């Protein structure tokens, strides 16, 4: 009857000590009485039997105090006869008394195959489960699939939510075992909460599936040794048993046992290369199936509500704290960020760079598919932790802005809305002459960013999205196509593609709106400089109380490079810069550009030169033939002699630290309200659309200040011509024809 936890191996050091050696834990007992008693606690004896063997040696009253004390601390158990010694050991090592463990396994289970899963294969799992004492037919339904996106799983999911059935999902076939999650209707995500993420991370399979419509899912689980199958099925049986049990023991000695299961988790075991990764499933609040899909719709039409955010370096929290809070978003399966890698030679402490794998949109052609997949994010920074946060949060920024279909919208024509609406041409700023020769220009165009859309037809009722005007403290309306990535438009009215201009993430909304505003300032300043080809003054990097600048300069010099910083600060007066670097030796000069703007000129220069770092060093080791970046033709062909507006103006004096007055403060919110008033007396409205996704948490917005300019070849009437004249940089405006014929490469 009576025994000590079966997983423990007993060793008696005869005077005083008795050791309990385990596979994961080691315990030690002290007391002459333990040495006397524990030998008799092996499951060979009952409490009635023990006393007679040591009758006259250890009192009967004394034994109880010992066995009591062994109970309170749980070293002592009673043997469960329905279990073998090895099985009982497995659960007692998880802190679970055998007799309780036996009761747990009595809870039955049902198996349901879906897709191509063999009826033979199902029987193999049934045999595995019975071998560990689990009967089959409830407490758990288990589903075996070949693909987690099988349409049939949609219908199984909706019954489980209606029936509140807790169920499990498994894929043992193929060279990568999928195991989990255990869906718990009300506590975890549904299958659809998961399926929403799977559909994103399968870009080529999703782009192949529609392309077929030129004329559910695709099964790609063909590699299966009968051993990997049995490996996966047997492995499933264990986790099923561990779930069944914990559900039973967390109610019957609550607390006590704390070991992980598959609730809201997915486990991938790659049989080929041998790698096991865990993946957290997030329950989407806006999930159409188990949540409320009207969340964003309601929020989008509600007033933007901001508040004070003191600073700790102009963010509210550290990068590592930001990275910690959002690591789980890094998963090729359940996540939004596919991979996050340090591509930096750690030999160099100054240069940091991260590559964040991004899922992005879907395409409908082989040519269009390869433009996606080329779409990757990147982290830049003075430090590693900040370079990491950068890469992660840029990837999430991109996802958040993609049009999911739950976005705040309404149908109307530009006339039904009144002055509340904003004509898209105010934002796009394409010239009359560009629209006229659309088709010709678009075909003979070196780059995809130069794409000139069809003219907006004001007679067509389109979808409008509400945006909050910080200047006017009220809602306005941009066409939805501008506000989110990959909004589907009719082929005869494709008046826009959603761009990345003004998009920003952050730990708070105000943090995000601030960074987003600065993105606009830089693209504006670059545009003025690049297309008017203005000669700009350089910055004296030494005048700033920051050694990282001079340390970086020296580093570039040793590596066949020079580095300087042009001032692009325009009429808004916000410090903006252009890092410029070039190679001294070789067939190629490999000019590279980095831009940055911020109220703090130091941070502004940081942003620029770390953008030059991430692009720069990674191309140089790579020879010319091997180069297949977008800016490839630019790095080989173009020399500094062809673009004298890249090197500084010897005519003007060097800009120093004393030349950029302080207009930032102790509050991020104040800085936001400062920027919006800067836009105001430049006669500009500042609009914000909050793209934040509940499932994501990290705040994402798109800041739009209509009329401000961009990197891309857009030559409409506006600031591109007039601001250089207003600043004295030009004596008279240029004509569209004298604009820079060479597009901004980066």
């Amino acid at each position: 009857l009576l025994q000590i936890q079966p997983h423990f191996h007993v060793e008696v050091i005869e005077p005083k000590q008795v050791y309990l050696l385990g596979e994961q834990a080691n315990h030690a007992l002290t007391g002459q009485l333990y040495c006397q008693i524990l030998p008799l606690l092996n499951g060979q004896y009952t409490l009635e039997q023990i006393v007679e063997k040591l009758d006259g040696e250890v009192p009967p009253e004394y034994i109880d105090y010992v066995l009591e004390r062994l109970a309170e601390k749980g070293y002592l158990t009673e043997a469960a006869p329905e279990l073998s010694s090895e099985v009982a050991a497995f659960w007692s090592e998880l802190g679970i008394a055998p007799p309780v463990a036996a009761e747990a396994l009595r809870q039955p289970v049902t198996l349901t195959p879906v897709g191509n899963i063999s009826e033979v294969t199902v029987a193999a799992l049934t045999t595995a489960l019975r071998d560990i004492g689990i009967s089959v037919q409830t407490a758990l339904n288990v589903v075996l699939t070949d693909d987690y996106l099988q349409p049939e799983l949609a219908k199984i999911n909706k019954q489980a939510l209606e029936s509140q059935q807790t169920w499990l999902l498994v894929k043992p076939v193929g060279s990568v075992l999928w195991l989990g999650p255990v869906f718990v209707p009300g506590k975890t995500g549904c299958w659809d909460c998961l399926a929403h993420r799977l559909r994103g991370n399968r870009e080529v399979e999703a782009s192949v599936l529609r392309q077929k419509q030129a004329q559910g899912c695709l099964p790609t689980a063909r590699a299966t040794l009968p051993s990997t199958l049995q490996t996966g099925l047997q492995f499933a049986a264990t986790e099923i048993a561990k779930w069944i049990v914990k559900y039973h023991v967390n109610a019957t000695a609550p607390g006590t046992v704390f070991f992980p299961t598959l609730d809201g988790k997915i486990i991938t075991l790659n049989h080929s290369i041998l790698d096991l990764k865990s993946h957290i499933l997030i329950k989407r609040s806006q999930c159409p199936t188990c949540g409320d899909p009207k969340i964003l719709q309601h929020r989008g039409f509600e007033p933007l509500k901001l508040e004070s955010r003191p600073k700790q370096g102009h963010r509210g929290t550290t990068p590592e704290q930001t990275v910690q809070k959002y690591q789980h978003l890094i998963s090729p399966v359940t996540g939004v960020v596919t991979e996050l890698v340090r591509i930096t030679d750690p030999a160099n402490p100054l240069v940091h760079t991260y590559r964040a794998g991004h899922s992005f949109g879907s395409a409908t052609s082989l040519r269009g598919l390869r433009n996606t997949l080329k779409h990757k994010s990147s982290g830049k920074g003075k430090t590693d932790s900040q370079s990491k946060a950068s890469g992660l949060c840029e990837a999430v920024e991109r996802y958040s802005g993609i049009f999911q279909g739950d976005e705040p919208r309404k149908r109307a024509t530009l006339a039904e809305l009144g002055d509340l609406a904003i004509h898209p041409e105010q934002c796009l700023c394409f010239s009359d002459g560009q629209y006229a020769n659309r088709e010709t220009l678009n075909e003979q165009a070196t780059v995809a960013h130069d794409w000139i859309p069809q003219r907006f037809d004001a007679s067509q009722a389109i979808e409008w999205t509400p945006v909050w005007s910080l200047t006017e403290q009220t809602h306005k309306y941009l066409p939805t196509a501008l506000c989110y990535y990959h909004y589907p438009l009719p082929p005869e009215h494709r008046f826009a593609r959603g761009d990345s201009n003004g998009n920003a993430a952050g730990n708070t909304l105000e943090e995000a709106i601030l960074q987003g505003f600065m993105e606009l300032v830089e693209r504006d300043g670059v545009a003025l400089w690049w297309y008017n080809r203005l000669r700009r003054p350089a910055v004296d990097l030494g005048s700033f109380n920051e050694p990282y600048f001079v340390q970086l300069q020296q580093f570039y010099r040793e590596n066949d490079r020079d580095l300087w910083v042009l001032d692009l600060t325009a009429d808004l007066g916000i410090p903006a810069f252009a890092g410029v670097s070039n190679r001294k030796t070789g067939s190629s000069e490999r000019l590279i550009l980095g831009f940055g703007a911020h109220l703090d000129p130091t941070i502004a220069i940081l942003r620029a030169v770390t953008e030059v770092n991430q692009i720069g060093l990674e191309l140089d080791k790579v020879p010319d033939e091997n180069l297949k970046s977008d800016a490839t033709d630019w790095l080989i062909t173009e020399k500094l002699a062809d673009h004298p507006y890249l090197l500084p103006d010897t005519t003007q004096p060097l800009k120093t630290a004393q030349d950029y007055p302080k207009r930032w403060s102790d509050d991020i919110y104040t800085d936001v309200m400062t920027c919006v008033n800067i836009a105001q007396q430049a006669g500009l409205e500042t609009l914000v659309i909050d793209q934040t996704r509940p499932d994501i948490g990290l705040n994402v917005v798109k800041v739009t200040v209509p009329g401000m300019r961009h990197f891309w070849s857009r030559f409409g009437e506006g600031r591109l011509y007039d601001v250089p004249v207003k600043l004295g940089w030009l004596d008279e405006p240029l004509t569209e024809a004298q604009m820079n014929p060479t597009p901004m490469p980066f």
């Binding site: 005083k16 834990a25 080691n26 315990h27 030690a28 007992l29 002290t30 007391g31 002459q32 009485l33 333990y34 004394y62 105090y65 010992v66 004390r69 601390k73 070293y75």
Partner: peptide, 12 residues
Amino acid sequence: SSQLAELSEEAL
């Protein structure tokens, strides 16, 4: 008692 006083259990 001393045989009951010195009873001790610990994890390592």
